[PDB]
Amino acid sequence: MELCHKTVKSRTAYSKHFPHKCQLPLGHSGKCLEFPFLVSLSKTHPRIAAKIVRDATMTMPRYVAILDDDILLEKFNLDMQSLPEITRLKIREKAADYDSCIDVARKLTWLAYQLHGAPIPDSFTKNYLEEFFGPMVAGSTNCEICKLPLTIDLFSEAAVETAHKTPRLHNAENVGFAHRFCNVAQGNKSLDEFYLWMEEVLTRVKML
Amino acid sequence: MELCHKTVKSRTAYSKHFPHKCQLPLGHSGKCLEFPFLVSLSKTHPRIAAKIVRDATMTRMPRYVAILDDDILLEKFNLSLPEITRLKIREKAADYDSCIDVARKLTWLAYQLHGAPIPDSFTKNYLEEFFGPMVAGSTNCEICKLPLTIDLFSAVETAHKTPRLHNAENVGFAHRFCNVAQGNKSLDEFYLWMEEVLTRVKML
């Protein structure tokens, strides 16, 4: 589909200098929204919707953490040169453009409706997300590391976190959900490196 | 062997109520010392020596202090706080003797690291008495099972094979990655977890 992309009215700091964008279809029979695919979820599970937005959008916003020092200082009043080297480094480590952050939000909502125990999504949400990522398959959502089926009750606050299959890549394809344990075990390795690692370790331990 | 164990002079908070003990062999000449097996290392690798002492004795508060109850903590040590700091301090509590044991084991491991300096005869003979012959480059990640190098100590962490067990048999070194990965699982549970993970991914 083609998206609205019209500027969404906001009282956000970012909104004073940059636009939040309409994510409704270009056609669009109402008021223009940033997170339409989350409306039902916000109605049924407020903290899950909010956690999806936060993990998709925040570190300050990831699409602010990508802006250069001059723009931070002048338009947001952030003197990066004041902060110690390490916090500048970590801030940059979390950077992602605006569209990517929204993409991630969409992916995570799509995964969430396929959790065991998930609410049933309305037809708009279902069709909109399915258009992006394919048919929803009930109960298919697993830990990206564990490969264990996740239940929505886990998201209750955590025990579940947002995962990046390959380190430092913030887009729809690369994200999912993971047990806290599995997510911290993976650390700075990609999935394939992590599995390869486990394989070598076990080989070694089975020797002697 | 038989150990000195006479009180060692300290300006420490613990020492006003409990002793620091000589760990030289009983009837030693010279002054009595708590960490004799570490003086040589402290000369060339003070950071490593310091890490060994911290990991063996500390939790902020010593492990052998944290094995004492709140009443003695307010009375003897004059210490009332959040719960996830309190029981978290309780978690890693161990007897003073076990702590020193851990320090011995860690030093014995350190002298067997690739690139390790060579121990002096006192240190070598003393530690080998407790743990057996040092063999060069034998020190491996407790988890990875790969050989460790001394330059990793600029990372490496002290590992516990079984959680909640601070003794010589149970401790070793581990790459930072391997050690955080293990989290709160024993070694066997961690390997078993890996096997389940690989089994599931090979099916997909």
Numbering used by the authors:
A (entry chain A): 1 to 59, 74 to 171, 177 to 227
B (entry chain C): 1 to 59, 73 to 92, 96 to 170, 178 to 227
Sentences from the paper on this structure:
DraIII is a type IIP restriction endonucleases (REases) that recognizes and creates a double strand break within the gapped palindromic sequence CAC↑NNN↓GTG of double-stranded DNA (↑ indicates nicking on the bottom strand; ↓ indicates nicking on the top strand). DraIII is a type IIP REase isolated from Deinococcus radiophilus ATCC 27603. However, wild type DraIII shows significant star activity. It indicated, as supported by mutagenesis, that DraIII possesses a ββα-metal HNH active site.
The structure of DraIII was determined in the presence of an 11-bp canonical DNA duplex containing a phosphorothioate at both of the scissile phosphodiester bonds. A complete protein structure was derived from a protein-phosphorothioate DNA duplex in the presence of magnesium chloride, although the DNA was not observed in the structure. DraIII exists as a homodimer and dimerization occurs in the C-terminus region where the ββα-metal HNH active site is located. Two zinc- and one magnesium-binding sites are found in each DraIII monomer. The DraIII monomer contains a ββα-metal fold (β1-β2-α12) in the C-terminal domain where the HNH active site is located. The N-terminal zinc binding site (consisting of C4, C22, H28 and C32) and the C-terminal zinc binding site (C157, C160, H198 and C201) of DraIII deviate from the CXXC/CXXC configuration. The DraIII structure is composed of two domains: the N-terminal domain (α1–9) and the C-terminal domain (α10–13, β1–2). More importantly, the domain interface opens up to the active site tunnel the substrate DNA would bind to (surface mode). Six potential hydrogen bonds are found between the two domains along the domain interface, which can be divided into three regions: the mouth, middle and hinge region. Among the known HNH REases, the structure presented here is the first for one that recognizes a gapped sequence.
